[PDB]
Subunit: 457 residues, 4 copies
C-alpha cells in the first residue's frame, strides 16, 4: 500500500511521514491552510507529502515559483491536478488540458479584455441598486443581517445577467427556474466525505465516469444545456462567445455551455465569500470603513453612481480589497502537474508530482510580512505596493493559467462595495464572531457566517 | 462473461437467448411491460431471462404464484431483489430483509389498520378542498389542465400531513423548505442510464455504498433526518410511530426516519400516476364519468363531504379504481429472491434466482380477460367480482409482503376523485393523447402527460 | 471513512482506536499473534478492533467461547469470515455457508471416521519409508538438513495418495505433472500485499470475482478438475467420495473436485509446518527426544513398523504433539460471523460482527499456563490432561465446524515422527535459529527455516 | 452505455453497428483475422468499430499507413493501445510511452545493430546443435514429432543465452529454476476471458494496478529481478545493456530487468510459432523443402556449420521465411493511439482513436496478391521482390516503432532451419492437420499443434 511513498526520502526532500493508503490526509483535519503553515515552519522552504499515493511537492521560493507558473508553464506545468469525475465538463477551460486548454484560453481571452469589461459595467451596476434595495429592507428593520445571503444573492444577480443576459432579483424571485439550479453551483469542498474518498481511491474515478455520475450535478447541467439552446436560437459573456464562433477551431456548441457553467462555478461563491470577508474587516475596523466611505464620497459626490473609470480612481478601495485577499486567498493553494522530469532552479522534480504553491501560508508568512495577522490596508499603498513580491501574493495566481476572470472579479466586487458603503455603514453585533474563525473544511470560508448591523446613511 | 447463462437451458426452462454481460437487457428497449407480454406469448407459462448475469424466472400460474407470495414467503421468498446503493435506507421496511423486515412489518402494521385509517380521513379530506380550489382556479380560466401537477400536488399535500403533521398548500407555497425536498422523492426508473448500469455491473454497488453515494439523494435525506428531530422534540403516521416506541425491539430513531421517507417514496408518484390514469379513463369514457357522478350525488346529496363510511358505500367508484389498476398496475412486476433451493408446484427453482410475477401482462392476458384492452369497469361488479383470480389481478401484490399502504392508498385516491367529480366534469382536449401511450421507460406512466378540459358543475 | 467505527465505543467494549479506512491494520505489523497478546493484556477478557470497516470482537472466556463454537453454532455462528474471490471453490466445505455447508459436512463426515482412517494407515505408512530413505540420503552425507523440504515433501506424498490414489516420490520426481501443481497449494498469508488490500477494499472482491481472478490459482484448479475426470472414469479420499454419490443431495461432480482441492490446501502446509516445529523442539530438548525414542522402541521392538493401534498406544508421543500444538496453533485464531443480533453469556453482539477466539495467545496465557513459553510435554500427562480447558486449548477448534481432518492430521504426523525417530536422531546445528523466531507475516511459521543435523541410529 | 458510439456515423466513416457496452466484440468470435477480412470486404478501405467504448479506425491505404507508421510517428501516433495492468513493466520499451519510449529506443538500438548481431551468431549456433540432437532423438525412434515442443524449446535455449548468458538444454533440463519461469512468458491472448473483460471494463485496470495484480505474473518477475542481481554482481543482450549504463539518462537497474523480460515475451512464442508454420509449409510442399535443402548444401557443402555471412547468402531461404510471414503475420494487426486531432491524407481522425492496420488481411488481400491462399515463395524472388508494397507486407511493422528485434528474429529462425534441414527431412503424417486451421483465439497459431514425421539424411 505504499506506491511511491519513498520518493521524497529518496530525493532527499523532507516532510511528514505517511501512513499506508492514506498518505498524509489524516493531517488535513485542521484544513489545508493550517497544514500548510506547519510544514512551512518545520521543513523550511521545500517539502513533500502524499495525498493518498499522490506525491505533492510544496515550494515557497519566488524564483522557483515563477519558473513553474510563468516560464515552464507550456512546457512542463500546464495542467492542474486531475479532477474527476467530470463528464462533458472536461471541455471547461479550467479542467481541460494541454492543447485543448490553449485553444480555449485563446478562444476566450478577448472576452475578459478591459474593453469588453468596460462595456459590461452598466449591467453589473444595475444589480448594485437591487443589492442596496435588498439591503435597506434589511437595515430599516432592526435586525442583524447575515452577509452571505445578501451578497450571495448579488453575485448571482451578476453571474446570470453577465453570462446569459437573464435579469433576476434572485433574492426577491427565489423560484424563477433559473435561480434554483445556478444556486446549486457551489465551489467544491475537497475535504468533504466524497472528495477525500477520491484521494484515497482515485482508481474509482473511471468507475464513476462510466456510471455517468458527475461532480457537476447531472440535473443542473441538463437544465442549462438546453436553456442556452433556447437562448442561442433567438455585451455579455454568452453573446461574446456566440460571436467568437462567427470566425484554432471555433468554440463548439457544448464547449460554449461548458464555459458558461464553469464561469458560474468559478465566480459565484468566490465573489460572495470575498465580499463577506471584506465587510467583516470594515466592520471590525471602523476607521478603515470611514476612511473608505470618505474616499467614495470624494470621487462620487452626492451618492453618484460608480463608473468604470471612477472605480479605477479609488486607491484606498484597492488597498482594502487587496489586503482582504491577502488574508483570505480563497483558493488557498495553486497547483500544477509536473508532466516531464525537470530541474527548476536546481531541484530535480520527477514526472507526475503535483507541484503546489501554498498561497494562504505565504500570504501570512512573517518572513515577508510584518504583523501578518493584522488587517493593515497600508501595506498596499503606492509607497509600499513595491516591496511586495508578486509570487508571494498570488490571490489570483500568476502566469498564462492564472484567473482569466480577475479584472471582472475585482471590478464586480468593487462596485458592490462602493454602492453599499455609499448608503450604509456596518457595525458589529454581539453575535458577530470575533475573532473570525475559518472553517477547518476544504473551503476558505468563515466557520460561522458573518452577521453585522446595517444602518442607513 | 456468461456466469450462469446456462442455468435455464440446463433446467429445461425456455426463454430468449442472452448476450454476454448484457443478458437480455437489450430487450428492455420496449419497457418491461412490452417485454413481458412477448415472453408470455412465446414461451407459455414459465420462462427465464437474464438481467446481466442475474437469472430471473417468470411464472404465470396461480397455484404457483400463491406458493411464492403466500405460502413459502417466510421460508423461501422473503426479500425483493437486492437494490442498492441504499445507505441507511437499508432500514426502510421495503428494502430490509428477512428478520429485520419481519420486525419492522410487525412494528408498523398497527399503523395501517382500518381503525387508524378511519381516524386519518379528516386530515386527508381537508386537502381535498385545497385540491378543488386549486382546480376551480384552473377551470374558471379557459385552459387545458395537466393532471400530473394538480394531482401530484395533492398526493404531496397528503403525504406530508399524514406522516409528519405538516400542512402545506404545496401548489400555492412551492417554496416552503419542506416542499422542495419531498418533491425530489420520485419512484425509480430502472431503465434510466444509472440503474441499467447497475444491472450490468452490480459489482459496482459496494463501491458506490463506500463512496457514500445514495439512490435516495444524500441531501434530501439530510434535511428530513433533522426535521424530524425538531418534530419529535416538541392521528398521523409520524405520531403513531413515536407511540410504537413507547412500548421485538421498539423502533429506533433513525429507523423511524427511514420509514417516513420510504412512505413518501412509495406513496407519492404511485398515487399521482393512478389518479391521472383514472381521470384519463373517465374523460375518454363520458358514460362512466356520468354514472359515477350520479352515484356520488346519491350517497352524498348536496355536494356533501365524503366520509370514511360513505367512501366504502360507493361501488361503481370501487369498480372504476379497480379497473384502472387492472390496466395500469404501476408496479408492473412483483419479485422475490429465491433464497434456498426449492420445488414449488413441481418445478425446481435453484437458490439465488429472482422469481418474478408479470402483473402488467397477466392483467392484460386475453386468457383470463375478454377484450383486455378495454376500460370496462363492469368486470368488477358484485356479479363478476367473483370470476377474478386474486393471483392474476395483483395491483398491490399478495401475501405477508404486499402493499402495507393499500387501504390508505385506495381511501386516499377515492376521496380525491369524489370531491373532484362532485364539482367538476372532465372532457378531453384536442391535445389529449388518444389513444394513451405508455412510456417505454422503466415507470408505468403516460408517454405524454395527461391534459384535459375541466368545467365546473 | 468510518462506517461502524463507533460500534465498540457505543456498546462500551474497549479496544485500540482506529484510523479511518485502515481501522487497526497498522497494528498487524507484528503479526496477529503479537497483536492478540497485547490486546489480551491491555483490555482484559473482551475487546474489539476493526479490520478496515469490519468490526471484530475478541473473546477469551470459556463459557462464552463454548456458546459461540458449540451451542449457537447452527443458529448464530455458522460461517467463517467472508473470504474471496473464490470462484467455484465456494463449494469447498470450509468456504461454504449455512445449509450448503451442513449438507457438505454431512456428506463428508463418514470419510473421516476412525474406521476409514484405520483403513488408510497402510497407504500413509508406505510414504514413511520414502521419507526415511529421503532422509538417510540426507544424513549419510554430512550436511545440515532443512526440515521444511523433507517434511514438506512427505505431507505431499500423503495428500496425493490419500485423496487421489497417486503414488509419488515427489522429492525424487519433482516433475511429475501432478507434483508441480499441488505444491502451488500453500496456505494463505492474510498479511501479504493482496489480502491486506482486500481488508481495506472488500468492495473489490465482487470486481475480482467477475474478472475471473481466483485466490485458488486459475491454472492449478484447471489441471486437477480434469485430472479427476480421468481418475473417476477408470481406501482413499477420492474413492470414498465417489462412493458417497452412489446413494441431502449426493455430492455433485465439481463439488467433489472442490473438496479434494480444499483438503490439499488445508492439509499440506499445516502438516509440514507442525512436523517441523516438533522436530525443532525435540532437537533443542534432547531429553524429550530420547525419552520418546525409548517409548517408540518399547511399543515397536526392532524398528517394527507402526500400526494404527500402536500409534494410539504411545502416550509421550501424544504429549509432544499436543504440547507442540499448544505453542504453535498454526491457525492462530478461530472466527465466526455473527449472523443475527444475540446476547451470549450476558453480552450483546450485533449482527455482522466477526467473533474471534485468539488461540495463539490463550495457549500462551500465563493465567491458564505456568511458564507458558517453555516446551513442557508433561502438562499433557494423564495426571494433568485434566486441568486443561478444551476451550482454551483449541489447536483444531471446537464444535460442529472444527477440523474435519483432525484424526487424520494427528495420525499422519505421528507415523512420520515414529519412523523418523526410529532411524535417526536430531541434533541442532550452529545455523539452527535459537531461540526460534516466528515470522511476523500472516502465517504461523518460523522466520528462518528449521535446519538440524540428522544422524543415523 | 454508448459513450462515443456515434463517432463513426458522425464522421461519415462506415462500419458494423455496435451493441451497448460490448461495442463490436461479439464479432471477435471468429478471431481478429477473420473479423478484419469481412470488414475489408464490406466497407472498403477505411472503417471503424468499437472495442467496448473504444473507437478503432481501420486503414488499408499505403500512403495513409506510411503517415501513421513513419511520418507522424513522433508527433501524433507514438504509442500503442494502453495495455494494463502492468506494474513495473511500464518501463519495458514496448509498453512505455512518448519520451520515455524515445529514451529507451535510443538506449537499446545499438544492441540490435548488424555488428552486435554478427557477434551473437556463435552463441545462437550452439543451440542449433542442441536442437538437432534433440531432434535426431525424436527421428531415430519412429514417432510423429510435435514441432511446438522441439522448436519452443529451441527459442528458449536462445532467449536465455542471448539475454542473460545462461546455457540450458531446456528440453533435457526441464527443471533448472530458470527454465520453469521463462516458459511462463507466453504472448497474451487478447480474446481470452480476462483480456476481453478488460476491453469491456477498462475502468478496472486502475483497480487491478492498485491490487498489485500484474499481467506479467507477480512471481515470474520476482525470480528474474533478483536473478539479474546475482548476474550483474559477478556478446549478449544483458551485457550489452550493462555497458550502455557505463556512459539521455543511462538505463537504470529495474529498467534493465524490464527490457530483458520484454525481450523474452516478445521473442519466445513469436519465434516458436513461426518456425512451426515454416516447417508445416515445407512438409506440405516437398518441392520447396527439397529446393531449399539443395540451396543449403550448395552454400554449406558437407553439412558445414552456418555463419552470419552464409545465412545472408541464401535467397530461397529468405523467400520461404518471408512468404511464411506473409501468410502468418503473428501480430495480425498494428496499432497506434491517435494522441491529437489530425488530418492525414485527407481524413480527419479525432484525438483518442486507436488507428489500426490489419496486417493479416492485407497480406491475404486478393487485390495486392494473386492466389493469396497459396504458399508461393516466388513472389519474393529478386524479380518480384519489387512489386511488393512495404506498407502492405508488414510482418514486423514499419517506422521508428517497428520490431527492434527483427534482424535477430530473422537470423535466429534462419539458423534453426538451416541446421535442421541439413540433417533431416520432414514429411507429413496422417495426424497432420491438412488444411491447417488457425486458432479462432486471440493468437495467430494453429488450432491443433503441428506434428510431422522427421527422417534423418
Ligand atoms: C474573488 C474572486 C476570484 C478569485 C479570488 C479567483 C481566484 C482564482 C485562482 C487562484 C485561480 C487559479 C489560478 C492559477 O492556477 O494560477 C483561478 C482560476 C480561474 N478563475 Fe478565478 N477567481 C475569482 C473569480 C473568478 C471569476 C469572476 C471568473 C469568471 C470567468 C473566474 C474564472 C476563472 C477561470 C476560468 C479560471 C481557470 C483559468 C484556466 O484554468 O485557464 N474566476 N481563479
Ligand atoms: C396506488 C397506490 C399504490 C400502489 C398501486 C402500490 C403498490 C404496491 C406494490 C405492487 C407493492 C409490492 C407488493 C408486493 O411485493 O407484493 C407495494 C409495496 C409497498 N407499498 Fe405500496 N402501493 C401504493 C401506495 C402506497 C402507499 C400510500 C404506501 C404508504 C405507506 C405504500 C407503502 C408500501 C410499502 C411500505 C411497501 C413494501 C412493504 C414491504 O415490503 O413489506 N404504498 N406497493
Ligand atoms: C496439523 C494439522 C492441522 C491443523 C492444526 C488443522 C487445524 C484446523 C483449524 C484450527 C481449523 C478451524 C476449525 C474451527 O473453525 O474451529 C480447521 C478447519 C478445517 N480443516 Fe484442519 N487442520 C489440520 C489438518 C487438516 C487436514 C489433514 C485436513 C484434511 C481433510 C483438514 C481439513 C480441514 C477442513 C475441511 C476444515 C474446515 C471444516 C469446516 O469448515 O467445516 N485440516 N483445521
Ligand atoms: C518472428 C519473430 C518476430 C516477429 C514476427 C515480431 C513482430 C513484431 C511486430 C509486428 C511488432 C510491432 C511493430 C510495430 O508496432 O510496427 C514488434 C514489436 C517489437 N518486437 Fe518483435 N517480433 C519478433 C521477434 C522479436 C524479437 C526476437 C525481439 C527481441 C528483442 C522482439 C522485440 C520487439 C520489441 C521490443 C518490440 C516493440 C518495440 C517498440 O515498441 O519500440 N521481437 N515485433
Ligand atoms: C489547485 C487549485 C486551484 C484552484 O483554482 C480555482 C479556484 C480557487 C478559488 O476558487 C476557484 C474556482 C475555480 O474554478 C475553475 O473553474 C478552475 C479553478 C478554480 C485547487 C484548490 C483546492 O480547493 C485546494 C484548497 C484543495 O487546493
Amino acid at each position: 500500500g505504499t506506491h511511491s511513498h519513498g520518493l521524497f526520502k529518496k530525493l532527499g526532500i523532507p516532510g511528514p511521514t505517511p501512513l499506508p493508503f492514506l498518505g498524509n490526509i489524516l493531517s488535513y483535519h485542521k484544513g489545508f491552510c493550517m497544514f500548510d503553515m506547519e510544514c512551512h515552519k518545520k521543513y523550511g522552504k521545500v517539502w513533500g507529502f502524499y495525498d493518498g499515493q499522490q506525491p505533492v511537492l510544496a515550494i515557497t521560493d519566488p524564483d522557483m515559483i515563477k519558473t513553474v507558473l510563468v516560464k515552464e508553464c507550456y512546457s512542463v506545468f500546464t495542467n492542474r491536478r486531475p479532477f474527476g469525475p467530470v463528464g462533458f465538463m472536461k471541455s471547461a477551460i479550467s479542467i481541460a488540458e494541454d492543447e485543448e486548454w490553449k485553444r480555449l484560453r485563446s478562444l476566450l481571452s478577448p472576452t475578459f479584455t478591459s474593453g469588453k469589461l468596460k462595456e459590461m459595467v452598466p449591467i453589473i451596476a444595475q444589480y448594485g441598486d437591487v443589492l442596496v434595495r435588498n439591503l435597506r429592507r434589511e437595515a430599516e428593520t432592526g435586525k442583524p443581517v447575515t452577509l452571505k445571503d445578501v451578497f450571495g444573492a448579488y453575485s448571482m444577480d451578476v453571474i446570470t445577467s453577465t453570462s446569459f443576459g437573464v435579469n433576476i432579483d434572485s433574492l426577491n424571485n427565489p423560484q424563477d427556474p433559473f435561480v434554483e439550479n445556478t444556486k446549486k453551483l457551489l465551489r467544491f469542498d475537497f475535504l468533504d466525505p466524497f472528495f477525500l474518498s477520491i484521494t484515497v481511491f482515485p482508481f474509482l474515478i473511471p468507475i464513476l465516469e462510466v456510471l455517468n455520475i458527475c461532480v457537476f450535478p447531472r440535473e443542473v447541467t441538463n437544465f442549462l444545456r438546453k436553456s442556452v439552446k433556447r437562448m442561442k436560437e433567438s455585451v455579455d459573456f454568452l453573446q461574446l462567445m456566440i460571436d467568437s464562433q462567427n470566425s484554432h477551431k471555433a468554440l463548439s456548441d457544448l464547449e460554449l455551455v461548458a464555459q458558461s457553467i464553469i464561469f458560474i462555478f468559478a465566480g459565484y461563491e468566490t465573489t460572495s465569500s470575498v465580499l463577506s470577508f471584506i465587510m467583516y474587516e470594515l466592520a471590525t475596523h471602523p476607521d478603515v470603513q470611514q476612511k473608505l466611505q470618505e474616499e467614495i464620497d470624494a470621487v462620487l459626490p452626492n451618492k453618484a453612481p460608480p463608473t468604470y473609470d471612477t472605480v479605477l480612481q479609488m486607491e484606498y478601495l484597492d488597498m482594502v480589497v487587496n489586503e482582504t485577499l491577502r488574508l483570505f486567498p480563497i483558493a488557498m493553494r495553486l497547483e500544477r502537474v509536473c508532466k516531464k522530469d525537470v530541474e527548476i532552479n536546481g531541484m530535480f522534480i520527477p514526472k507526475g508530482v503535483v507541484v503546489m504553491i501554498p498561497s494562504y501560508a505565504l500570504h501570512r508568512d512573517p518572513k515577508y510580512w510584518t504583523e501578518p495577522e493584522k488587517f493593515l490596508p497600508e501595506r498596499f499603498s503606492k509607497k509600499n505596493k513595491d516591496n511586495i513580491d508578486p509570487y508571494i501574493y498570488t490571490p489570483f495566481g500568476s502566469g498564462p493559467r492564472n484567473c482569466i476572470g480577475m479584472r471582472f472579479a475585482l471590478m464586480n466586487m468593487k462596485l458592490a462595495l462602493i454602492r453599499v458603503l455609499q448608503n450604509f455603514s456596518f457595525k458589529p453585533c454581539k453575535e458577530t464572531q470575533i475573532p473570525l474563525k475559518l472553517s477547518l473544511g476544504g473551503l476558505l470560508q468563515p466557520e460561522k457566517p458573518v452577521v453585522l448591523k446595517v444602518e442607513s446613511r
